[PDB]
Design a protein around this ligand. Structure first.
Ligand SMILES: CCC(CC)O[C@@H]1C=C(C(=O)O)C[C@H](N)[C@H]1NC(C)=O
Ligand SMILES: CCC(CC)O[C@@H]1C=C(C(=O)O)C[C@H](N)[C@H]1NC(C)=O
Lengths: 519, 519
């Protein structure tokens, strides 16, 4: 009778064995009905030589109380199972058919007798490991035959699917999880991605957490094995689980190509959250510490940690740390790292930290706005910094401007208006006209484009210095649930990179042409 | 000044590398204070030849918000970490000292400078893998010296510590978790322990769950590798995750030594709870199925599953299943399995299912009591069955009597009064006077002895057919948190075995002398 099809707007990972290409619900089957044949068509332009395999799975039925509008009973390919993040959980999906050479038209068969009511099938797509990150698939279920009669196909399934790469999967290198992405592009065009390595579980500091780094010299097609950018092991003879460092922020000093990573080292504090347990004072026994490493060799090797806590932290603050993601070099060569501090009354404020001496000494002035935390900063115009802030009020990003490196702040017109959020980290970068193919100054922004939950990870572009974010100048990458944090860096003149927590992997990299954003 | 010591009443596992013997809190240290020496003393009659090693660990400090009355900042030895359930998580505990030859007096040293305020240390004990399950340690911290001055020792640390064995640990044989213990003793004195094998996670049916079995010919000192007693894999071409079977109940037919295992097979139901999603009807597509396997070779090999659903399940019931744990043979040779059914209005009832034909045909009559679920049955006196029930009203076990195999029920004097519970599975068995060393009829009962949470797993004995459970006739085995389910079986004339979910392992076995219960 009737069959529903979903083409989910989620990344096809080039390093995965399985990727959800279609989910399919047959809502009102009679017991014994067989999906004899289903035909997929790929668009004319699609590079079918890059597809290694297409599979048709059966995932059985639905629970009587979970309704009839779902496209699956369970996650088909897990992003958390430390034993398998790369293939379909074989306990939830049974392969019906497989094709290892893919033409524009493809048929998949089954002889599986359906149950009465809801039955779930899904198409998996496996790409070649060397598949272009810039390739796209346009796929449609054109025919479904049940008991040798072609059934009616319904559903929105016209999505243009993009590639990505799972730089870090849950369980990689004995690590439980990876969180809190940062991304910069070195002067040599090298992509450097930083993250928490959370060994024991996925809970925030305090825990056994190191700062990791993934390096790519080929615009993200391949990533060199994980380096530990910063670690404190069993410092002062306290357990490694009372010595975590994380929430990393990375910048490239564009004048020297010296790379800096800043992070919060929590020392002691039992097995409880630093957010609530970091207390006033200055010593490592008293409060979270602001720690920095540097790389002079394009991110290959990393200096020992220097403690900058004494330079910038007020003693009365419960907690000073970087804003996670990245910092910037300004036109005049000032290095800028967004920061956040919880004051004596447990009220969080977003601000900036800067250095005028190639990162030798760091300074913080005034907070931008009350009840904000995680922020990212861009030089929207010469000498003028735009701070884009996570706001505990909910619903929308706070936006301020400073022309004096945070001594005074002014509200931007886009404040609490233009950029929706659910209270989550967001990435903002600026691109100079001469440094990109459109030949105009850009602001690029990424976050979960929702007021509730963390999903619909989206890159947005502004042509007018973040006054307007036109709906036409946006690309949806991941419409399913994840931990939500992202970071942007331009790869080259034509493409932006995004390093983000996604529905398909803890650290996901995707590349998007500027001309896909802007008509 | 003052130092606090805890001797936690939890099983010392003979198969573990580490076991918590003592937790110690130093509440108000000065920064730099060193625990120079700590002396532990064992009773004269203790078998110190069974101790392989004793270790002193440092676990650092406590979080500012978690108070000053805790004995640890974190679980030291995990019962859930699939990568390590046998040794202390090295990220939470740093070894200070170790002794491989243990005398009646033992000293442990450190040179670790303490932090200001709370510092945590703990003593680990490792036993010989062949340590007697009936051996006990009586250990006391007699001295603690800080900066070469003997500090004041406080705390209740007079516990007589018992041995146990982790039959199943989280992660064993590629399984995420194990739940729902059942235990019988065959006519050959063989222990047979059954459980859910939960491969994907620890959630109830519906999921990828098999019934496992562990067999011991030496009264629980050693366990043969895990056998799958019952499995439905990819039946009818539905995923194994929509084909789970669990909540096993086991009995020995004492006339034949034929062993029977009964379990609930859920077929379909998406990835949601059978408790709410099993619907009225009789077919496997419609409702949970009552399945049985048997062993004629003392539990070495298992028959294919037979479907009992047709014989005993009313079509209008949403869910019929066995009560997890064990069933019995009565004096007249009737085989009895406790059952539970959810009626058309979603109201659960506890009852019994019996066979008079060596398990050929099964019958259910009337429910004992409304809003009860998991029950265990014992033949208190000839022809007279006591049903001990989990009660959704809270606080205490329901107890009924039937002398007509459930056609009529009468409330027992102990009903909703004598046995506290938190709404959890409990074990009850009867022991004939001629079959045990005390030479009197016993009832033995085990559960979490609390009205809140699942902890203080305790065996209780009654000399007067469950009318009274004297506090003196009880043994506390596990005062820390676990999933709470237990099952009892007499090993021999002198000792009772308990197969239970514990704070130290998913499937824990311990042996207790009858004379420790009744002194
Ligand atoms: C420090 C407070 C901050 C904002 C509320 O919490 C962040 C929220 C997070 C979140 O909402 O997911 C994850 C971050 N890892 C966490 N940072 C730390 C240091 O705990
Ligand atoms: C009818 C549901 C049943 C009895 C109330 O709930 C039990 C509770 C459990 C529990 O309280 O831990 C675990 C059991 N595995 C579960 N059984 C099933 C099949 O869900």
């Amino acid at each position: 009778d009737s069959v529903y099809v979903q083409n989910p707007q989620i990344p096809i990972l080039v390093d995965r064995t399985d990727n959800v290409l279609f989910r399919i619900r047959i809502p009102d089957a009679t017991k014994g009905d067989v999906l004899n044949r289903l035909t997929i068509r790929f668009g004319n332009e699609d590079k079918l030589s890059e597809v290694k395999a297409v599979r048709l799975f059966y995932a059985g039925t639905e629970a009587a109380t979970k309704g009839r509008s779902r496209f699956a009973p369970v996650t088909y390919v897990s992003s958390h199972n430390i034993r398998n993040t790369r293939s379909a959980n074989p306990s939830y999906s049974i392969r019906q058919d497989e094709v290892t050479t893919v033409a524009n038209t493809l048929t998949l068969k089954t002889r599986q007798p359906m149950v009465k009511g809801i039955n779930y099938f899904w198409v998996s797509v496996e790409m070649d490991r060397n598949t272009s990150l810039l390739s796209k698939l346009t796929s449609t279920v054109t025919e479904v035959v049940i008991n040798d009669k072609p059934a009616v196909i319904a559903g929105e399934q016209a999505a243009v699917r993009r590639m990505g790469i799972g730089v870090r999967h849950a369980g990689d290198d004995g690590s439980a999880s990876f969180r809190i992405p940062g991304l910069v592009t070195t002067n040599k065009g090298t992509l450097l991605g930083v993250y928490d390595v959370r060994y024991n579980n996925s809970v925030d500091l305090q825990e056994h957490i190191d700062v990791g780094l993934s390096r790519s010299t080929d615009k993200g097609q391949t990533w060199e094995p994980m380096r530990i950018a910063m670690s404190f092991g069993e410092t002062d003879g306290l357990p490694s689980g009372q010595n975590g460092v994380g929430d990393p922020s990375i910048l490239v000093d564009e004048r020297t190509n010296t790379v800096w990573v800043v992070a919060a080292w929590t020392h002691g504090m039992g097995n409880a959250r630093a957010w609530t347990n970091s207390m006033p004072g200055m010593t490592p026994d008293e409060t979270a510490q602001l720690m920095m490493v540097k790389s002079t060799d394009d991110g290959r090797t990393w200096s020992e940690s220097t403690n900058i806590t004494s330079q910038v932290k007020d003693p009365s603050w419960c907690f000073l740390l970087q804003g996670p993601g990245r910092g910037i070099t300004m036109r005049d060569g000032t290095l800028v790292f967004p920061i956040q501090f919880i004051d004596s009354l447990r009220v969080p404020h977003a601000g900036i930290m800067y250095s005028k001496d190639r990162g030798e000494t760091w300074h913080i002035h005034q907070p931008a706005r009350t009840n904000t935390t995680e922020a990212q900063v861009a030089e929207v115009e010469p000498g003028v910094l735009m701070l884009n802030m996570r706001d505990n009020r909910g619903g929308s990003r706070a936006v301020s401007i400073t022309r004096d490196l945070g001594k005074s702040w002014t509200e931007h017109s886009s404040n609490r208006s233009a950029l929706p959020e659910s209270i989550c980290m967001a990435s903002l970068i600026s691109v100079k006209a001469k440094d990109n193919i459109i030949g105009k100054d850009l602001l690029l922004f990424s976050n979960p484009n929702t007021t509730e939950g963390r999903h619909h990870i989206t890159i947005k572009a502004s042509l007018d210095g973040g006054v307007t974010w036109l709906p036409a100048h946006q690309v949806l990458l991941d419409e399913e649930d994840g931990w939500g944090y992202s970071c942007l860096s331009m790869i080259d003149r034509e493409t932006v990179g995004i390093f983000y927590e996604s529905s398909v992997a803890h650290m996901t990299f995707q590349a998007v042409k500027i001309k896909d954003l802007i008509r």
